[PDB]
Every structure is written in structure tokens, then in C-alpha cells.
Amino acid sequence: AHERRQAKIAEQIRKLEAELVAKRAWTLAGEASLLGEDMEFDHVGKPVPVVTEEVSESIEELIKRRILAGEFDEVLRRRP
Amino acid sequence: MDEYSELSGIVDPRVLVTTSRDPSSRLMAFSKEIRLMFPTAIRLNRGNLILPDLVMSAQRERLSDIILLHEHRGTPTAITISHFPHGPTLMASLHNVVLRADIPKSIKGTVSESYPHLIFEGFRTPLGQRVVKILKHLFPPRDPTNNAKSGNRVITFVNQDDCIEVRHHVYVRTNYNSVELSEVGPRFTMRPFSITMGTLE
């Protein structure tokens, strides 16, 4: 009677621990092995700012820089 | 080893783009512009399709990735990317969405669908490098020889704190030391919030 209640409590504890562990994995990987388990973050208390025209303009300058310097990040073909 | 290392650089990815059920006209327009970024992507109308039936068919046909676009009250709100056969799955929220027709100075005319270059800027953490790997492998590999000199299209991902600005441009090399960009769209901000090690059911 009192020990089936304990089963449900332990179920809640296990579920809360699983959430906590997935959040700690996210936090740790975002600091600079660390990429082997599920990770999540709840950004709840943060809005996302609008992107100013200044920022989009500097992105354009970044792109021109990369093109003229030949600095590209896609995967390159290889032989198996 | 990871989920990408065996085939990375050897095969072109085969990507499927789709939406939640009953998509708004805005979500449909966004899904076409998302599709256009990915030269080896097909787009499947969601119809009445049940997601487990969709995932199983894509698995059967040996597709490599699914991109699923979600919305709320008529606005695109999230993107789910899942790599086949067995993971990983990335989810991110969507913000500041701007379609091509609403971008000042966006190209008009046809967009050539050459294999694009990619630019990843500012992913200075293991989490950031994991996201780059997931995104990068949605695009086919390019020939390394004279790569730095060829091409005419680029998709750009710029990470600042926890958000990623995404852009899509064609360009003309007007001289050895000058380039003109023409923006294709869409614009949007992506904020990753989950990376799990498996796939969709």
C-alpha cells in the first residue's frame, strides 16, 4: 500500500534526473566524449532579438571575404 | 566514428522536406524556399500522411535525412532534422522568418541550382561543432579541385550565442578581387534546443 506510492515517487525522481542530465550535457558541450548522449535546453526566459540591418550587412561582408579568400566549409569529395 | 563518418564525402545525401499536417500558405511557401537551398532534396506534400508511415517509407527508400517544418498560428515556429538510418535528430525553434518576396533586393529570375558552398561562422564549442556536422551533411560534397575558384551559390550559417542566422545567395565573380551577391532567401534565425542520439519513430 505504502510501497506502491514509493514506486511512483521513484518514477518521478528518475524522470527529473533524466531531464537534469540532458540539460547538463547541453550546458557542458556549450563551453569549450561530450557529444554521446541526448541533450536539451529550455530557453524559456529568453526572447530572440530582431536582426538589425547592420547585422545582415556585416553577414554580406563576411560572405564576400570568404569567397575572395576561398575559405569554404562544405564537405569535399574523396575516394572510398 | 560517428553517424556521418562512414559515408561523408562518398555519397550525396538524399533529403526529404515536408511540413506538419494542414499547412498554412505561409508554411508552404517557406517549405519551397527551404527545399531550394538543398540541391539533392525532394519535397513531399504532407497530405493526410501519418509521420510513422512517412518515416518508414523514407527508411525503406534509403533516404538519408528528413527535414520537417512546424508552425503555430500561421507562422513557422520549428524545424526538425533527422538523419537516417539511426540518428541523430536535431530540433530548433525558428524566428525572424522572411520570405524571398519580402527581402529588399532579392534576386528575381531563376536561381541556378548548382551545388552550393557552405559558410559556418562562429561555432566555437563542441555543441556548435556537432550542429555544424548535422547541417553540413545535408548538402552534397563538392569536387575539391579548384573548389576555391568555382561555384556561384552559397548558404551561410552565422552563430551568435545560441542562435544561428541563415542566408542564401547567388554570386558573380566580377574580377579576381571583387564579387557581387544576390540574395535568394529565405532569411531566418534558428535556435537549436534538442539533439537526441536516435531517429523518429
Numbering used by the authors:
A (entry chain B): 475 to 506, 515 to 562
B (entry chain A): 74 to 274
Authors' description from the paper:
The Mpp10 complex, consisting of the long disordered protein Mpp10, the uS4-like factor Imp3, and the Brix-domain protein Imp4 was identified at the center of the 90S pre-ribosome adjacent to the UTP-B module and close to the 5’ region of the U3 snoRNA. Mpp10, and its bona fide binding partners Imp3 and Imp4 have been shown to be involved in chaperoning U3::pre-18S rRNA hybrid formation by destabilization of the intramolecular box A/A’ helix of the U3 snoRNA and stabilization of the U3-hybridized state. The heterotrimeric Mpp10-Imp3-Imp4 complex is an essential 90S module, which is localized at the core of the 90S pre-ribosome adjacent to the UTP-B complex. We propose that Mpp10, positioned at the 90S core, provides an assembly scaffold with linear interaction motifs for the different members of this pentameric module.
